[PDB]
Design a protein around this nucleic acid. Structure first.
Ligand SMILES: [Mg+2]
Lengths: 114, 36, 46, 97
RNA sequence: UAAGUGAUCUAGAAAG
RNA sequence: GUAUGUCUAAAUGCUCUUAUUUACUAACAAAAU
RNA sequence: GAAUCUCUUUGCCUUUUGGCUUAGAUCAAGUGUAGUAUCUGUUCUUGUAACAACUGAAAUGACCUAGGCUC
């Protein structure tokens, strides 16, 4: 019952491998886990303007974003991500990408950096 | 904001709870007195 | 605390990620160099 | 598994759900995505549940699309989504029984 | 001619 | 200290991949020779 | 003289604010620290003739009191 709980109770018949298999079988059917744009909490490094309503969301402002994987990676084996945000006033989907060549981000049809 | 000051406190009487408070437990049943 | 993003995997400005990127570049870069030289040699031969 | 979703789709929970399904017949038709092609659902109860779910979805869609910033494109998009939902519902009202 | 005996604290769980 | 809130009418088995994690959480704490 | 309406000034008006704390703290950081959680595809699904038998189903509505014949 307590966040540092050592052992979760299992039923008396719990073939772990079998259980895993079952879960897998019922993971394609599952709504969540079988989808993109999984949530995340992030502060905004770019400090940018929301292109619709010009709301000047500043640096380090916290948002409940959606992180999604971009299939087209950078180079070969180092992934890059789309990080969706909403502007506070108008609900326009701002987002950005993390191209690690410059050790920084790229704006993605959301707003503009300034 | 709601970080707000105040105007007045309160005192309204409900049905007692019947909870065994630690301090409320008995202690110093004997009252002292003066000499006269 | 201050800047949250600093405690995220996806954040590229996180140092680990940067290191990884560098490593990737370094390996790939090396490969390119190896191939580049070969290409040059071939050109010379031609 | 912060933020609850992870917890929900943690293996143990999934296993529990499966067990429930097996013995007694507790499904959560909220939890699984409704199938695209009907007529791969021989049971009636399941079909009914699916229909209910779609109705709920439609209702949800309706509730949001009358919001004050009406000129925004999300609302417009939903209008098509709403239509789709309606169509789905209609389909679910098939005439096998 | 006589050294070298004994004194020994502790001690983890929750939430924040 | 892993926030929160509204919203709810009453295909089947199969196998193969791993020396990893699209992992998530930051309420917690912050210095040199 | 009395009734009323319109404008200006004075009075009355949010000529502007409902807490405290180290101005609450900081405009900085390869972070550290604690926790919580599991994944990749590919597939299985005989004809012809003769003899014996039937000539026809389903829908809802027209009669009578769910049942019974007719159209
Ligand atoms: Mg507290």
């Amino acid at each position: 019952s307590e966040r540092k709980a050592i052992n979760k109770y299992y039923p008396p018949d719990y073939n772990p491998l079998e259980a895993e298999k079952l879960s897998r079988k019922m993971a394609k059917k599952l709504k969540t886990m079988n989808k993109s744009h999984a949530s995340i909490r992030l502060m905004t490094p770019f400090s940018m303007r929301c292109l619709e309503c010009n709301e000047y969301i500043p640096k380090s402002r916290k948002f409940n974003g959606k992180k999604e994987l971009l299939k087209e990676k950078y180079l070969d084996s180092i992934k890059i991500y789309r990080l969706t945000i909403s502007c506070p006033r108008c609900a326009n989907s701002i987002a950005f990408r993390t191209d690690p060549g410059n050790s920084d981000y790229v704006m993605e049809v959301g707003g503009v950096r300034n | 904001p709601q970080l707000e000051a105040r105007s007045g406190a309160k005192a309204a009487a409900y049905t007692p709870t019947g909870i065994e408070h630690a301090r409320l437990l008995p202690g110093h049943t004997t009252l002292k007195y003066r000499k006269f | 605390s201050g800047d949250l993003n600093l405690l995220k995997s996806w954040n590229p400005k996180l140092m680990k990620n940067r290191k990884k990127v560098w490593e990737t570049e370094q390996d790939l870069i090396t490969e390119q160099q190896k191939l580049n030289t070969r290409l040059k040699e071939i050109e010379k031969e031609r | 598994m912060s933020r609850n979703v992870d917890k929900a789709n943690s293996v143990l929970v999934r296993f529990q759900e499966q067990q429930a399904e097996s013995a007694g017949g507790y499904k959560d038709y909220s939890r699984y995505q409704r199938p695209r092609n009907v007529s791969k659902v021989k049971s009636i109860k399941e079909a009914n549940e699916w229909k209910r779910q779609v109705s709920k979805e439609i209702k949800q869609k309706s509730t949001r699309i009358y919001d004050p910033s009406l000129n925004e494109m999300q609302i417009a998009e939903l209008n098509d989504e709403l239509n789709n939902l309606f169509k789905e519902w209609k389909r679910w009202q098939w005439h096998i029984d």
